[PDB]
Design a protein around this ligand. Structure first.
Ligand code: MG
Ligand code: MG
Ligand code: MG
Ligand code: MG
Ligand code: MG
Ligand code: MG
Ligand code: MG
Ligand code: MG
Ligand code: MG
Ligand code: MG
Ligand code: MG
Ligand code: MG
Ligand code: MG
Ligand code: MG
Ligand code: MG
Lengths: 185, 49, 104
RNA sequence: UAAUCUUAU
RNA sequence: AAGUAAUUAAUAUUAGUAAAACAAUAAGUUAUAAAUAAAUAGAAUAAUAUAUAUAUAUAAAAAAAUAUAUAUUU
RNA sequence: AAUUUAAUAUAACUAUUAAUAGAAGGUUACUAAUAAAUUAAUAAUUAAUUUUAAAACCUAAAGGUAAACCUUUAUAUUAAUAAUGUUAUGAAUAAUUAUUAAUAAUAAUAAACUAAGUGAACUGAAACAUCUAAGUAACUUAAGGAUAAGAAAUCAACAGAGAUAUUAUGAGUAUUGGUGAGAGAAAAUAAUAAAGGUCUAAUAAGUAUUAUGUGAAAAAAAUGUAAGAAAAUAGGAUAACAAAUUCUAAGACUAAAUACUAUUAAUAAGUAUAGUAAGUACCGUAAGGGAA
């Protein structure tokens, strides 16, 4: 097979922003939660952006009679709503799937496994939703593997002292600001 | 935020690092000389015939 | 000698640079991790146990071999025994005629 | 009936 | 304010070259052999067709058709 | 000293070739200004390079709206001080001014070229229904200075070749068609072209393949539904099978020749009704049409 309707897609190349450079005119309010999906978000069978369609877009072709009188028809995939169990998330995740995709999931032995397969083909035939799911699972796995220590209290201890010092000079200081200051330190 | 690396990807990276760590095959001056001499001999033989 | 070597075609020169003749590369398929792994053969990766495709794909390999033949630098290239390709006079001599030719 | 699906909170 | 242009094919006239022409890097097109659906066939054994070549047919002729031959190849 | 002829301007468009590069409108006003440096050659300078000021309102996307208006309140808080006047008991509570620190904001952005989605009909076939027109027009979406393609699961044929892409021959040949209308390759040889090869993949499975429904007029690679392999001892390629040959799918990157726009130069058996105004006048509710 091929992933033509996926890998054809192109997204505007964001310029790498240095810390000292000037701002863009429209900077967003809330930050980027998820990583950027290489292949954007489908602009044709937008039905499939909400689910795990397995790179199965709608076809259009011809109904043909005994007289060979051609008439345009479309061929939809066998989509199905299906709440499937994630071991990593410890909850079942309900989404639209192609019956094919459900079969693949069953073969691979789980939904998390299906999401996390490292092949490029899989990545292509994950949606934007599928990509987000993968990210959620992978991040959770990483957390499970590696808890922070294998600092917050120190910051909390120092904060009031820092505030007092600021006041003694003359200025007031708030927590959030303190946190912002001492993130990289 | 950058997506984390899955297990297979990490293993591949480790393998690549190990490969890099080994001594790299590099074409020595001596090897080039040996080749060049052989080429010359071949040319001489061609000229003769 | 060095000047003569330099005068060799580009692809051949590049090959010699990146797979030099000091290393005696294997005739048979090997581990992908091995130093003597033949770039023309499909070597097996030891962990996954999957045959990797040759580092030099078959066309490129053939071109390299033809270049070597032209400039008489065959034996410095690693062996093409277990790659099924023969070339020119050796191919002509060693081959069996087709069943159709011998027995119509 | 933890296949599916409809409704209400 | 109305037979124009492009890419092609066939004729004719002239001009260049000519059993060759165009092109010169090779490659190609046309000509130089006529046939036949096609095939491994193809033009005086001692001369004008009464000979020869091909297609049908055949042991080989004859028979229909078209083509080839009477110092210099067209 | 003057006249003529030809060429050149800040001051025409159009076609070609070459080279280079990938770019604000309107509205009406409390009109929407600028300042400098260094280097060059002989203080002012022109030129190059660099810095710097202001710049209203509207042009979907601070929030509205009946474009050039209204409302949000950054000549804002919040805090800390200082000066002032009042209340109640030197300390406390509110208001005004002036410094210091902290908190957010301004989409007018091309068009052509490219890729993807959906996809007509008139028309041709001297009718028309397969076929054609045509994957064209159109609408929709998305990208970049170009995009696309690209280092063979390619071609070929027992001899061999060796990314791409465009053109010439091959060739209107093979091929195909209600065998009608008509449609039509590839190998090979030439140019143009750039260093043109090179790993970035732990070598790829619901994949190849099969059935079935569709699918570039020849030549497939694609695709909905469902069955579904193999390890280089293998796998792809041709009705089929046997031999042979060739290549390695389900992981990737890539200048260059090309397209379009703009600029500059050069050439015009081009334009003065293809020679600069104006998308104005005017027509229409509107999209839109459009003079002299
Ligand atoms: Mg007969
Ligand atoms: Mg706005
Ligand atoms: Mg008609
Ligand atoms: Mg009628
Ligand atoms: Mg068509
Ligand atoms: Mg289209
Ligand atoms: Mg590209
Ligand atoms: Mg052609
Ligand atoms: Mg591969
Ligand atoms: Mg493989
Ligand atoms: Mg099929
Ligand atoms: Mg066509
Ligand atoms: Mg490959
Ligand atoms: Mg690419
Ligand atoms: Mg009116």
């Amino acid at each position: 097979r091929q992933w033509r309707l996926i890998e054809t897609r192109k997204i505007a190349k964001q310029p790498n922003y240095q810390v000292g450079d000037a701002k863009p005119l429209h900077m967003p309010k809330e930050r980027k939660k998820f990583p950027d999906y290489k292949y954007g978000e489908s602009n044709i069978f937008k039905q499939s952006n909400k689910g795990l369609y397995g790179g199965s877009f709608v076809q259009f072709g011809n109904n043909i009679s005994e007289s060979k009188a051609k008439t345009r028809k479309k061929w939809l995939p066998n989509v199905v709503k299906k709440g499937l169990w994630s071991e990593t998330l410890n909850r079942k995740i309900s989404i639209k799937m192609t019956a094919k995709v459900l079969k693949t999931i069953s073969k691979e032995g789980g939904i998390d496994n299906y999401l996390t397969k490292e092949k490029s083909a899989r990545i292509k035939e994950l949606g934007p939703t599928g990509w987000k799911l993968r990210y959620r699972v992978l991040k959770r796995k990483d957390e499970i593997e590696n808890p922070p220590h294998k600092r917050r209290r120190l910051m909390s201890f120092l904060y009031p002292l820092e505030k007092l010092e600021y006041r003694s000079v003359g200025k007031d200081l708030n927590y959030k600001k303190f946190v912002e200051l001492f993130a990289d330190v | 935020p950058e997506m984390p690396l899955t297990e297979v990807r990490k293993s591949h990276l480790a393998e690549k690092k190990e490969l890099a760590e080994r001594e790299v095959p590099k074409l020595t001056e001596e090897d080039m000389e040996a080749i060049g001499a052989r080429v010359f001999e071949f040319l001489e033989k061609q000229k003769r015939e | 000698y060095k000047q003569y070597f330099d005068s060799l075609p580009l692809k051949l020169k590049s090959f010699f640079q990146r797979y030099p003749p000091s290393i005696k590369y294997s005739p048979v398929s090997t581990s992908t991790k091995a130093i003597n792994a033949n770039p023309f053969l499909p070597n097996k990766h030891p962990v996954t146990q999957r045959f990797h495709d040759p580092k030099y794909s078959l066309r490129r390999m053939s071109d390299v071999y033809k270049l070597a033949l032209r400039y008489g630098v065959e034996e410095f290239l690693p062996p093409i025994e277990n790659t099924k390709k023969l070339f020119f006079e050796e191919k002509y001599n060693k081959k069996t005629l087709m069943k159709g030719v011998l027995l119509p």
